[PDB]
Paper text:
Protein synthesis in mitochondria supports bioenergetics of eukaryotic cells and is executed by dedicated mitoribosomes. To provide a representative reference for studying protein synthesis in the mitochondria of fungi, and to reveal how the mitoribosome functions in coordination with its translation partners, we determined structures of the translating mitoribosome from the representative fungal model organism Neurospora crassa. The fungal mito-ribosome consists of 78 different proteins, 23S and 16S rRNAs. Forty-eight bacterial orthologs are extended, and 30 proteins are mitochondria-specific.
After subtracting the signals outside the tRNA binding sites, followed by focused 3D classifications, we obtained three distinct classes with tRNAs occupying P-site (P/P), E site (E/E), and in the hybrid P/E state, at the overall resolutions of 3.05, 3.10, and 2.99 Å, respectively. After peptide transfer occurs, the ribosomal subunits move relative to each other, which is represented by our P/E hybrid structure. In the rotated conformation, the L1 stalk moves to a closed conformation toward the deacylated tRNA in the P/E hybrid state. The bases A2381 (G2168) and C2348 (G2112) of the stalk rRNA stack on the elbow of the P/E tRNA. Unlike in bacteria, uL1m does not interact with the P/E tRNA, instead the domain II of uL1m changes its conformation to form a mitoribsome-specific interaction with H82-ES6 in the CP in the rotated state. Therefore, the subunit rotation is synchronized with the L1 stalk movement during tRNA translocation. The terminal adenosine of the P/E tRNA inserts between the conserved G2873 (G2421) and A2874 (C2422) at the E site. The anticodon arm of the tRNA remains located in the P site forming the codon-anticodon base pairing with the mRNA resulting in distorted conformation to swing the acceptor arm into the E site. The disordered N-terminal extension of mS29 gets structured in the rotated state and interacts with the minor groove of the anticodon stem of the P/E tRNA, suggesting mitochondria-specific regulation. The long C-terminal helix of mL108 reaches down to the mtSSU, applying an additional stabilization of the L1 stalk.
Residue numbers in the entry:
A (entry chain T): 44 to 88
B (entry chain W): 66 to 122
C (entry chain C): 221 to 330
D (entry chain I): 1 to 46, 59 to 131
E (entry chain Y): 95 to 140
F (entry chain d): 33 to 218, 243 to 291
G (entry chain L): 2 to 193
Write the structure that this text describes.
Amino acid sequence: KRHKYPTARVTRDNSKQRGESALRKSGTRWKLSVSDEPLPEPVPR
Amino acid sequence: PKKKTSHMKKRHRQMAGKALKDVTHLNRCPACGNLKRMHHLCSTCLGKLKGFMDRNG
Amino acid sequence: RGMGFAGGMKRHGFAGQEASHGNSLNHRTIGSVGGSQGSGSRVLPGKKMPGRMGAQQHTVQNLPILMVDNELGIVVVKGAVAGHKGAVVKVQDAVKKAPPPEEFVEATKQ
Amino acid sequence: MIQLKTMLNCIDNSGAALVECAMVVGQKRHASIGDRIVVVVQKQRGTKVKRGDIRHAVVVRTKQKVQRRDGSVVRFDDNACVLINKAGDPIGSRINGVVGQELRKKKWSKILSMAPMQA
Amino acid sequence: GPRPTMSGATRLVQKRRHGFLSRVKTKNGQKTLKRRLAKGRLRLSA
Amino acid sequence: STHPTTAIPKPTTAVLKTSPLAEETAVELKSPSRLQLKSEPGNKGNPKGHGDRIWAFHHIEQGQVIYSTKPVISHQHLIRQQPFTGKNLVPRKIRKDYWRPLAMIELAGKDQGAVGRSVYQKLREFKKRHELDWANEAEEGRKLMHKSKRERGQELNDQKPNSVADMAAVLAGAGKGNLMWQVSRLVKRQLRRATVYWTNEQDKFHAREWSDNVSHEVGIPGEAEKKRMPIRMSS
Amino acid sequence: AGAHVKYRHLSRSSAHRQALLRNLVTSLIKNETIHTTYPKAKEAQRLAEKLITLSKRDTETARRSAQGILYTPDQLLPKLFGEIRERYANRPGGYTRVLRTEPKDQYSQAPSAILELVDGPKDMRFAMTAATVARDREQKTESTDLTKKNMDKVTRFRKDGMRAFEDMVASLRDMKFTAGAINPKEWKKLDR
RNA sequence: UCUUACUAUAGUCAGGACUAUAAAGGUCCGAACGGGUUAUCGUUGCAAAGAUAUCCGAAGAACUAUGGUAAGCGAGUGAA
RNA sequence: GACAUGAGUAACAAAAAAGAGUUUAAGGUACCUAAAAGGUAUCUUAGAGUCUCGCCUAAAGCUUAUGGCUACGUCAAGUAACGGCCUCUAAGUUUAUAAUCUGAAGAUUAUGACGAUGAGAAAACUUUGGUACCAACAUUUAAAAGUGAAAAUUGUGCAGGAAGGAUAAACCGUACCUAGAAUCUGAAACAAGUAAGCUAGUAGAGAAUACGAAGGCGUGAAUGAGAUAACAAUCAUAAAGGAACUCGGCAAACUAACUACCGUAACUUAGGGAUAAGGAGAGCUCAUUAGUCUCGAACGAGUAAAAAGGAAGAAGCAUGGAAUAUUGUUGUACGACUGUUUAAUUAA
RNA sequence: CUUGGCCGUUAAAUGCGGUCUUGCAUGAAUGAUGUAACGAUACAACAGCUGUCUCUAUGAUUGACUCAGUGAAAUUGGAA
RNA sequence: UAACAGUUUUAUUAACCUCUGGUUUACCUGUUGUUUAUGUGCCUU
Ligand SMILES: [K+]
Ligand SMILES: [K+]
Ligand SMILES: [K+]
Ligand SMILES: [K+]
Ligand SMILES: [K+]
Ligand SMILES: [K+]
Ligand SMILES: [K+]
Ligand SMILES: [K+]
Ligand SMILES: [K+]
Ligand SMILES: [K+]
Ligand SMILES: [Mg+2]
Ligand SMILES: [Mg+2]
Ligand SMILES: [Mg+2]
Ligand SMILES: [Mg+2]
Ligand SMILES: [Mg+2]
Ligand SMILES: [Mg+2]
Ligand SMILES: [Mg+2]
Ligand SMILES: [Mg+2]
Ligand SMILES: [Mg+2]
Ligand SMILES: [Mg+2]
Ligand SMILES: [Mg+2]
Ligand SMILES: [Mg+2]
Ligand SMILES: [Mg+2]
Ligand SMILES: [Mg+2]
Ligand SMILES: [Mg+2]
Ligand SMILES: [Mg+2]
Ligand SMILES: [Mg+2]
Ligand SMILES: [Mg+2]
Ligand SMILES: [Mg+2]
Ligand SMILES: [Mg+2]
Ligand SMILES: [Mg+2]
Ligand SMILES: [Mg+2]
Ligand SMILES: [Mg+2]
Ligand SMILES: [Mg+2]
Ligand SMILES: [Mg+2]
Ligand SMILES: [Mg+2]
Ligand SMILES: [Mg+2]
Ligand SMILES: [Mg+2]
Ligand SMILES: [Mg+2]
Ligand SMILES: [Mg+2]
Ligand SMILES: [Mg+2]
Ligand SMILES: [Mg+2]
Ligand SMILES: [Mg+2]
Ligand SMILES: [Mg+2]
Ligand SMILES: [Zn+2]
């Protein structure tokens, strides 16, 4: 970060979990390091 | 109401011109032979054909 | 021109009642419909009330003819005429005026 | 369309500057260019007419649009008048400003005699 | 007219004001029980 | 804005196959990371001993999982790791009589904390991608899309089976930048040794197959002191 | 007392009315058919035929006007200016068809109709004419002038036309769709 | 368990402004909160006292919570 | 008590809002087929879900209370991440004891007991009186900065601000509902009312105003679909005139907020009146830059840094652009003033 | 008695303000009297503003109306 | 003969929109705040 004073230009989205929901299968907000990996399928109970 | 409505006058209001009109605008479906309404689609062929176009395609 | 069911203001030119000085649900109403027992204990025939308006015959008299064109088939008359565009109207010589000259009545017949 | 309690600009050299209409002489409908009215002087300019006098006036121009025979329509930015007497002739001697051309056929030749501009 | 006088009513005040022990431990409360018992009431208190 | 993936076959960076959809295994999708080359990535800017052990707690009734770097969990873990899966389904607090340690991962090198912090990241990222972007369960397996929003919320709270599969994948090199790898770049690479302690021997069978660098042991340190005996299969 | 209504207000507000019509046209282009009330099918028709005319136009304004009527332009604009544009490139208007049916909701009993895209994959009048021609050939009956007239309507502007219509009649006879149909020569002897 | 007064234990009052104070004011503008000025609607009402708008107080003689005390010959409580 | 009439009428209208697909179970019809079956389609009843649209949003959301005619597989030694029970006491209570008073019933004082709305050791392992005190208000303080608490420090004002005790894990509560969509009080599935915490973000002085991420909702057919007459309600706009309306400017409209802007009268208890009145400015682009910040190497460059900034400039009918804050002045009576009152017709 | 006399305000004043007195039947802590400040008190005037009005018109939603579903009430000696 | 120029008012009733206005809730244009979708999008070797 270049400017650190509290009044610096705020160009980030302060709503981290924007449009993010588990019941509606919204998907991740950003591309994670495991986003291109096939979800491991476990053995059911 | 000042007085009770008699049986004569209440029957006039309920029956004079309030007879359920018969539906005579009826024809038969061409591909079905079933009785349908005039200028309307056959309800039996609609669902069947609507379902037949869902399997084939 | 037809106007469907009309109130008392449009049909008979009633003035209506107040707008804000306490009036309660009677801004466009017709008010009193008549007098009490001495007047007949009834609503008199011919009482002006709401109802259907328009869609009736109407005559406009003494309208000159400004233009006459046979090709287009039009007869331009001064003023307004009852009805909508495309409606049929009846045109005839004015009754409150003298008939056209004898020469004209004979020339047309000729 | 001049009616009761309407404020007018007297453009006559009679002493009044702003008059208030009190009556429409000779008709019920609102007065327009060329109609008589009874006004009450509310302001003066500095035997002139003093504030509070009741005189007859003639509407010379109005802010309401005026239809004419030839389809031409005239609208003025303000409503003005000229004071007259019960006889009908002007009280003042000169008129400053444009007046409506409807004063011609309404028998106001005296008012037009000293009218510099007609519109 | 009637008023919603039981709004926000707690059941701790019912036991204190109309409970069984508010009556067996007072002279006038023993009458209520004896009166209600003579009539055959099942609900002697609260 | 969010971007949900689809249940389609993709290549994996792990040694073993995580899912039946995985196309290939041990695929290098990006150049090795800086710490991957290093044989012994040390605890540069973290406390002494941090990262060498990673704990996993679960709800023994509803199946909700929480990862932790310390032997205990706090209210923060519950607020930051549990998404809203419906009403009356997100506990307002941690109840001591419901949450028990699920497992514990201990690395061979007791001073290379950087490897554990990476294994911890991939585990939390996989979990977020299980609660969200569960395209592999909409029409297959549990079929969450064929269920009601109530039953769907109760199946999304049950992350214990998925978590025990995320460990077999993360410990096998799943993910990009997973420091569980060790590239020589003389180019040969291998996996780092690790040990997983289980309170229940049967829980470790949720993963269809485990890697060859993980050692399985019964009993987590500190649980025997609480008079909690582990569950053994062979008895 | 005032002016006659320009269009149906459908007992709704201005914003709701506009949104409702955009949904009816968005589902029509997405599914090629919708089964709704007759008044809604007739109001969404005028907006659907004006949206298909926008696709034929080549101006950039036409493309922004279509983006402002559909509710998922990113997904349906390719289909509007793609398959649909090619379909109605030689048809001068009348891109939709409203057909009355029985009440979709028996509780209300409200008159209902199907709004379809002509020459589409789910054209109902195209399938009803094929079923009629199928019953005729199966019963050795002579097609009426009204059946032949409809046979030319649903095969004039279609891609292949008659070929796509004969395959429908053949497939309907392959599965015995006309099994149990009453012959027209026995209609006059039925009171029920 | 309503309501009036008192009592004990507690809680609440965004932000801004003026004034001698950083904090000393039955101060000012204005939300929450508390009131109920005016009008309309309603009047077999959504409501046996409501709705909408407008208006008043809003660090105080303030508002609120859980308990307690005082009432029916004599009158409890009462800014009446 | 039963059954009529009004009447198959009113009503099922909180100004949130619906549209098109899909699917499960049971059952009713039609056809296929007559070996029963099964299949295809449709309808009824009880549900579930997908795409789109909208409403609430310091809630109509989430977590919990008071409470509950909603339903019973709701799980704890303690702390982090919990209350009760238990200990201590306040206001008070007492058919406890003693003494005293008293037509009886009883009452009083003292002691005891009981009595929360308060106080109760330790823990991510644990078992004297300003040398003061923990009412209000202000200030300071967990060292990168900011913000919100906790506790403590210092100080201010008068209205002068509790009590008491100390310091190997029993029993009880744990389900659901929180009032705009099926649960509390209002006779009820009532447009009313009810406690605590949390309550995305942009933008702001702000919990104001507008949008709304998640969540919820767009009621148990307690409704649905049409049509868009009079009239009513709730609104919007309006030529010319501008209170001519009316008991009366009732209602409505005008005005409005912001700035460390300019200016501000009579009178006055000298505090005020006063935010009097009346004016000016505002958004976007840009010249310009002492310091702070960033970058490169004192200096140079930069607003993909906060700010400052001028009689600069551009576009449009309009830059307090949408929403939010409802006129100004003057003369009297009455009452000094802030307050209080007929819960639900009189607020003076 | 009375719309008391005069003055000012209005084109027009039983109102309002100032003033004079013979005040049916003002008057001094049932306080008398004069200002500042204060008031959702009451009265009057001015400017502005407006559908309050001259004089209404158009537009919007919900009802009203029709179809489908459910289904009241006051009232009624008997009624051609 | 041609050309040019001039030939009431008020009130009331009704009809009618050529004109002059008012209205315009699915028309065009401009524009503020905020949200959503899609496209695009910084410097340097
Ligand atoms: K009669
Ligand atoms: K205030
Ligand atoms: K009705
Ligand atoms: K708000
Ligand atoms: K306990
Ligand atoms: K005694
Ligand atoms: K509510
Ligand atoms: K007013
Ligand atoms: K009160
Ligand atoms: K016109
Ligand atoms: Mg017509
Ligand atoms: Mg009127
Ligand atoms: Mg009204
Ligand atoms: Mg008679
Ligand atoms: Mg009472
Ligand atoms: Mg209470
Ligand atoms: Mg719970
Ligand atoms: Mg309706
Ligand atoms: Mg709108
Ligand atoms: Mg104050
Ligand atoms: Mg009424
Ligand atoms: Mg005040
Ligand atoms: Mg009736
Ligand atoms: Mg009716
Ligand atoms: Mg069936
Ligand atoms: Mg005790
Ligand atoms: Mg307590
Ligand atoms: Mg209830
Ligand atoms: Mg309710
Ligand atoms: Mg709710
Ligand atoms: Mg709905
Ligand atoms: Mg106007
Ligand atoms: Mg105007
Ligand atoms: Mg008047
Ligand atoms: Mg009058
Ligand atoms: Mg310009
Ligand atoms: Mg007072
Ligand atoms: Mg007061
Ligand atoms: Mg009262
Ligand atoms: Mg009152
Ligand atoms: Mg005295
Ligand atoms: Mg009905
Ligand atoms: Mg025209
Ligand atoms: Mg449009
Ligand atoms: Zn058929």
